[PDB]
Every structure is written in structure tokens, then in C-alpha cells.
Amino acid sequence: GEWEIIDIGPFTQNLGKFAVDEENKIGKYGRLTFNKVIRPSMKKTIYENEIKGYEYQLYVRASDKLFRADISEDYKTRGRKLLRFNGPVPPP
């Protein structure tokens, strides 16, 4: 894979919302309220071994705490899945 910094525009915010919504269905943290994806946002390109998919790592502020969310995206299907949601974590 290769990692790159991505900006925190609407698409990235919408990934953050996705992570919180998914976590709220999962229920590990009870009910979270999405606030914002903060910098830095990172995106890993995963080759088939030719792009297979991507992994986003986002710092997501929800319920006034910070969480680290890792989201996978399948290049062909366009489907996304919440892989990890850790925290609360300290600020990057």
C-alpha cells in the first residue's frame, strides 16, 4: 500500500458521518453524535497484488471526544465498511 494525506472537505466529513452512523448501529459506545473529521486525514491505496481498494484513517470528533476510525472502500463495488473505531484517543 501507499499512504497519502487527504483534505477534510465534504467527502471526508461524509466518511466521518458514515463511521459514526456505523458505530452507532454497532453500539460499542452507545449513541455518538458526529461533530467533525479533523486533520490529518489519511488514505491508503491497496493494490490487487490494479487498485483493489482504499483504507481511510480519520480522526473523528463525536460527542466531544476524538476517535480513530479506519474505513475500507472497495474500488470495484464502491462499498465501504467500518474496519476499526478506537478511542477516545488523544489529539494527533
Author numbering: 1 to 49, 54 to 96
Question: What did the study's authors say about this model?
Answer:
Monellin, isolated from the African plant Dioscoreophyllum cumminsii, is, together with thaumatin, one of the most potent sweeteners known, being about 90,000 times sweeter than sucrose on a molar basis. Wild type monellin has a cystatin-like fold, composed of two non-covalently linked chains, which dissociate when heated above ~50 °C. This is accompanied by taste loss and prevents the use of the protein as a sweetener above this temperature. To circumvent this inconvenience, single chain derivatives with higher thermostability, among which MNEI, have been designed. All sweet proteins elicit a taste response upon interaction with the human taste receptor T1R2-T1R3, a heterodimeric G-protein coupled receptor (GPCR) located on specialised cells on the tongue.
